[PDB]
Write an enzyme that holds these catalytic residues in place. Sequence first.
Site, PDB file in Angstrom:
ATOM      1  CG  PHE A   1      -0.606  -0.699   2.527  1.00  0.00           C
ATOM      2  CD1 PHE A   1       0.829  -0.414   3.098  1.00  0.00           C
ATOM      3  CD2 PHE A   1      -1.187  -1.495   2.978  1.00  0.00           C
ATOM      4  CE1 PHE A   1       1.011  -0.965   4.052  1.00  0.00           C
ATOM      5  CE2 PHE A   1      -1.097  -2.354   4.219  1.00  0.00           C
ATOM      6  CZ  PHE A   1       0.275  -1.864   4.954  1.00  0.00           C
TER       7      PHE A   1
ATOM      8  CG  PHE B   1       4.228   6.081   1.086  1.00  0.00           C
ATOM      9  CD1 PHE B   1       4.738   6.417  -0.088  1.00  0.00           C
ATOM     10  CD2 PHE B   1       3.122   7.020   1.498  1.00  0.00           C
ATOM     11  CE1 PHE B   1       4.584   7.658  -0.782  1.00  0.00           C
ATOM     12  CE2 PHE B   1       2.656   8.146   0.881  1.00  0.00           C
ATOM     13  CZ  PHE B   1       3.146   8.437  -0.607  1.00  0.00           C
TER      14      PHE B   1
END
Lengths: 134, 129
Positions: free
Chosen positions: A52, A54
């Site tokens: 997802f 970062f």
Amino acid sequence: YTLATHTAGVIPAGKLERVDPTTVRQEGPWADPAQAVVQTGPNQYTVYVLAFAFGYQPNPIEVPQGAEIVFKITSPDVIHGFHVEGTNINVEVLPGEVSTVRYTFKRPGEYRIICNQYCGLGHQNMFGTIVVKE
Amino acid sequence: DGAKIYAQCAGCHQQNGQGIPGAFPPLAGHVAEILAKEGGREYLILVLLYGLQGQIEVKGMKYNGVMSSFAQLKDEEIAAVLNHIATAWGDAKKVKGFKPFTAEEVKKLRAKKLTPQQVLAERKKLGLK
Ligand code: HEC
Ligand code: CUA
């Protein structure tokens, strides 16, 4: 020669595995960081990785060495990349697309995942953590 | 509401608010630490609207991730989750005169286009490694 060996596992599967990136993080094998590692055969374990914003789930990705790990990474937002520094794992992670790669760790240690594909202003800090058990 | 948005926070900080060592920092027993700082509440909003990206060190533990820019969420939602988390762990009860986050504070920062990489400096300016 790579296709004539188990080394071909580092190459993404030819089969399409498209799902919904919206609810993939709420319902499915990527909705639980606990049951991310599921045995799918003799010394074969499939690990569902959710890439997802970062981040990478689960983290750190703890896996046993000397076994065939079926990595199934998918993204619920934008494009990402699964380039594990120190390995031959270099596959693209598309939104709602499950990139399947079969790897076999022959050496333990901590590995950092480098997301080559862009993603926001902090795309360069998107480094996941992988810990192979000795 | 705050619970609806909390589901997004659980994706990285989990429902425990502890996060992941070396990837996601904890919130429980940490929000109050920031709320006690001058401008800490503003940082909490900035870190949500834009985020943060570096190698922060919380309690001696260094991380390496990036906050998700929840700019797609409404100002009220951003403030709601902030109020929810602060009251959830009761971190807002460890400060003197806790002021609930209002959409006004979110709007003023949303108008000021910044980057999570710049917020890193703002965070360190507060003394937060
Ligand atoms: C992964 C996709 C995340 C989600 C979803 C949320 N957060 Fe997060 N957050 C994340 C990271 C990687 C970091 C650290 C950045 C770094 O440079 O390593 C953070 C940090 C925060 C902080 C700041 C902590 C500090 O300054 O010590 C806060 C206050 C925070 N995150 C709040 C927060 C909330 C409320 C979320 C849901 C709305 C949320 N985060 C989601 C990664 C991720
Ligand atoms: Cu995700 Cu680059």
